[PDB]
Ligand binder design. Structure first.
Ligand SMILES: Cc1oc(-c2ccccc2)cc1C(=O)O
Length: 273
């Protein structure tokens, strides 16, 4: 069934999320990514409107599934004896933001603005769907190179969005907020804003600002690259130590640095050719 409907291509990557393969849906040659997740490694299990025992990732992907291209689309899923197999859409050609930054270095601000804006729309979409990604980072962002569109992937560390405190975290530590580091306590939106500040810094500087807990806790931001004041202001704002001092998604998107964003197609034409 999974074996007959899909032609398995090469391994795209593996890690904490499991193993993701390039693939093609045999019926219409649709490019897909086949993600295998070991059951023993699934800590968060959820229930669909049917009531089946599935990993939370599947619940979250279904909650965020729509025509909106800013988030990876779950096309299908299969349960195997010891794993879950997720069929995800696969943009072609594609490059993750991490590989993009590794190759190109620090992004021009116009490019970072377009990318960052698309990440914001994608995160806002997650949140409107009741999903907290919890692992917003360059590696979890795919660039559809032809369309200039970004896709948020890997909902495997995610949770249902709630207004109460989260005391569990399995996303990326260097993207985690100081309140998580110090107290093991964070609120969804403000931790997402912190990780967005790390991401924005990473986009415009070519690397994350903090490598150690103490740097996270201190929250002193040093710009190793020439970054505009408006951009440094937005970064410093997302990276406020006090969760309540962080901007809301609205304030980030109304920030002066975020004005006159390029359309994804314009972004592709100028920067991804
Ligand atoms: C790790 C991962 O990689 C992908 C993917 C990679 C290249 C093209 C399309 C999708 C999705 C996920 C996921 O976890 O959702």
């Amino acid at each position: 069934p999974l074996e007959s409907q899909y032609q398995v291509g090469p391994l795209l990557g593996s890690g904490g999320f499991g193993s993701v393969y390039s693939g093609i849906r045999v019926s219409d040659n649709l490019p897909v990514a086949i993600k295998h997740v070991e059951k023993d490694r699934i800590s968060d299990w959820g229930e669909l409107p049917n009531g089946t025992r599935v990993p939370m990732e599947v619940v979250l992907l279904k909650k965020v599934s729509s025509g909106f291209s800013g988030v990876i689309r779950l096309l299908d899923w299969f349960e195997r004896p010891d794993s879950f197999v997720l069929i995800l859409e696969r943009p072609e050609p594609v490059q993750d933001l991490f590989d993009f930054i590794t190759e190109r270095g620090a992004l021009q601000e116009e490019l970072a603005r377009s990318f960052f804006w698309q990440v914001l729309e994608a995160v806002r979409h997650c949140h409107n769907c009741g999903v907290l990604h919890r692992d917003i980072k360059d590696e979890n962002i795919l660039i559809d190179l032809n369309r200039g569109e970004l896709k948020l992937i890997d909902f495997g560390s995610g949770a249902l969005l709630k207004d109460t405190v989260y005391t569990d975290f399995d996303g990326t530590r260097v993207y985690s907020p100081p309140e998580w580091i110090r107290y093991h306590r964070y609120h969804g939106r403000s931790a997402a804003v912190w990780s967005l500040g790390i991401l924005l810094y990473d986009m415009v500087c070519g690397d994350i600002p903090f490598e150690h807990d103490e740097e996270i806790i201190r929250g002193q931001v040093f710009f190793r690259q020439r970054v505009s004041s408006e951009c440094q202001h937005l970064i410093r704002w997302c990276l406020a130590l006090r969760p309540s001092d962080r901007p809301t998604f609205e304030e980030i998107q109304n920030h002066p640095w975020m004005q006159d964003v390029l359309l994804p197609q314009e972004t592709a034409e100028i920067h991804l050719h």
